[PDB]
Design a binder for this molecule. Structure first.
Ligand SMILES: CCCCCCCCOCCOCCOCCOCCO
Ligand SMILES: CCCCCCCCOCCOCCOCCOCCO
Ligand SMILES: [Ca+2]
Length: 208
């Protein structure tokens, strides 16, 4: 007893703009200031480094313009955080240090809305295990509602990549490189999947 469950929404930066939804459980015990948060994040992300040279001095940013290709990227991030809340702060704001584990689903690539380049779509993917650290600030606003601030940093371990090309006839090709297969180093320099991620969000938590 008693056990305080809230749902928390936040918006802001996670390697790109996006948001998160989470459930928090706190006051898990009479004595304890332990807290647990499970959360999911969606954010935009950049998929290929514009400054990477494929030539020649010619960069992916350069050929992107030439062929009018559309780049897109995203991260979906499942996270678990253990939070601790210091007693006799003594501040008007609650600050909880937290550490946790993450699982990220990265994906992006480009489409060929035309002209040139047969015509099609190319997509790359990586699922990574991450670790991270941060602080969560909460301020009581109204009944059952607090303002929440969150700053943290996550690190992700390099994982395999999976490429899918699709032609106009609809034919599909698939492949994957691992650490450490042949062209992995190169793929990894070019593909903008997570490594270090700054997390900076504002949001609100509703109790019950
Ligand atoms: C302030 C901590 C940063 C310290 C690390 C040095 C430079 C960090 O860049 C490393 C590359 O990390 C790539 C993550 O990019 C942001 C996430 O969004 C794109 C990935 O999907
Ligand atoms: C939060 C503390 C964790 C300590 C991090 C130490 C890192 C040592 O192992 C690094 C292994 O990860 C390989 C890096 O992956 C390549 C990233 O480049 C991505 C761009 O495509
Ligand atoms: Ca880019």
């Amino acid at each position: 007893h008693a056990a305080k469950f809230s749902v928390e929404a936040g918006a802001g930066f996670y390697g790109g703009f996006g948001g998160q939804l989470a459930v928090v459980a706190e006051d898990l015990a009479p004595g304890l200031p332990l807290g647990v948060r499970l959360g999911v994040g969606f954010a935009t992300s950049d998929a290929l480094d514009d400054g990477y040279d494929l030539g020649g001095g010619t960069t992916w940013g350069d050929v992107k313009e030439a062929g009018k290709f559309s780049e897109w990227g995203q991260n979906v991030t499942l996270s678990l955080d253990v939070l601790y809340k210091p007693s006799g702060l003594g501040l008007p704001v609650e600050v909880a240090p937290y550490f946790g584990v993450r699982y990220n689903f990265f994906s992006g690539g480009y489409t060929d809305p035309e002209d040139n380049l047969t015509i099609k779509a190319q997509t790359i993917s990586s699922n990574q295990l991450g670790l991270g650290l941060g602080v969560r600030a909460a301020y009581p606003l109204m009944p059952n509602l607090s303002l929440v601030g969150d700053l943290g940093v996550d690190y992700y371990f390099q994982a395999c990549f999976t490429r899918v090309e699709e032609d106009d006839s609809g034919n599909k090709s698939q492949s994957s490189v691992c650490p450490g297969d042949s062209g992995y180093e190169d793929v990894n320099k070019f593909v903008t999947q997570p490594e270090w991620v700054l997390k900076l969000r504002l949001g609100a938590a509703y109790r019950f």
